């Protein structure tokens, strides 16, 4: 249960590669775009441990979110090249996967993001930030979905 969360920031991850998500679950690491890496680094560092950064993962075109992971370190920008599905993916940070489970978009699309033109949360791009009150609604639904 994620209702205890008073602080904390939540981002959507949209992957072109399901293989990269499988690698991320296996080794508890992730990376993002050049902009996404800077956005997440800033958010993690500004938290100063006062609350979590959660990542809500979804494979482009799958019609479902596939789980949730907590960001667990700052971004190292200079790391081994070519570990992901494509060479463009640079950098690395630790994550801890909290839920690994498929949740259909139909369960989530009523939740709209006031910072993204009131678009459904299921129509977000990679690294879209989610307002906390809408993030808690998404997390409650992922956690109790069966
Ligand atoms: C890897 C990775 N990090 N962030 C991403 N976003 C879209 N596609 C991907 N393969 C990735
Ligand atoms: Cl590495």
CATH of the domain at 85: 3.10.590.10
Pocket of ligand 1 contains residue 85 by CB under 6 Å: yes
**Pairing state between β 64-71 and 93-104:** antiparallel
Q: Exposed, middle or buried: residue 58 (CB in 10 Å: 0-12, 13-18, 19+)?
A: buried
Q: Which candidate, 105, 103, 131, 104, places its Cα nearest to that of 118?
A: 131
CB 69 near ligand 1, within 6 Å: no
Q: Are 80 and 38 in contact (CB under 8 A)?
A: no
The tokens describing 69, both together, are 């992971």
CB of 89 within 6 A of ligand 1: the answer is: yes
Range 127-140 burial, b when 16+ CB lie within 10 A, else e? bbbbeeebbbbbbe
In short, whether 18's Cβ falls inside 6 Å of ligand 1 is: no
Instruction: Give 115: exposed, middle or buried? Use CB within 10 Å, 0-12, 13-18, 19+.
Output: exposed
- Count of domains forming the chain: 1
User: 89 labelled as ligand-binding?
Assistant: yes
Q: Does the annotation flag 14 for ligand binding?
A: yes
Domain range for 123 is 1-146
Contact 21, 146 (CB under 8 A): no
Q: Which experimental technique did the depositors report for determining this structure?
A: X-ray
Tokens of 101: 């489970």
| Centroid of ligand 1 to alpha carbon of 75 (angstroms) | 15
For residue 141, give every residue at least 6 positions away whose Cβ sits within 8 Å of its Cβ, in sequence order, or none: 103, 107, 108, 111
Helix (H) or strand (E) holding 100: strand 93-104
Give resolution, Å, one decimal: 1.9
Nearest CA to ligand 1 atom 11: 15
CA 14 – ligand 2 centroid, Å: 21
């Amino acid at each position: 249960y994620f209702q205890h969360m008073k602080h904390g920031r939540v981002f959507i991850i949209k992957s072109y590669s399901e293989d990269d998500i499988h690698r991320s679950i296996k080794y508890n690491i992730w990376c993002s775009t050049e902009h996404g890496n800077k956005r997440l680094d800033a958010a993690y560092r500004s938290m100063n441990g006062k609350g979590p950064v959660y990542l809500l993962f979804s494979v482009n075109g799958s019609g479902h979110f596939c789980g949730v992971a907590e960001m667990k370190s700052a971004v190292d920008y200079n790391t081994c090249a070519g570990v992901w599905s494509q060479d463009k993916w640079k950098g690395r940070f630790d994550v801890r996967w909290i839920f690994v489970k498929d949740v259909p978009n139909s369960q989530l699309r009523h939740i709209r993001l006031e910072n993204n033109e009131n678009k459904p949360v299921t129509n977000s791009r990679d690294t879209q930030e989610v307002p906390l009150e809408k993030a808690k609604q998404v997390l409650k639904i992922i956690a109790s979905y069966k």
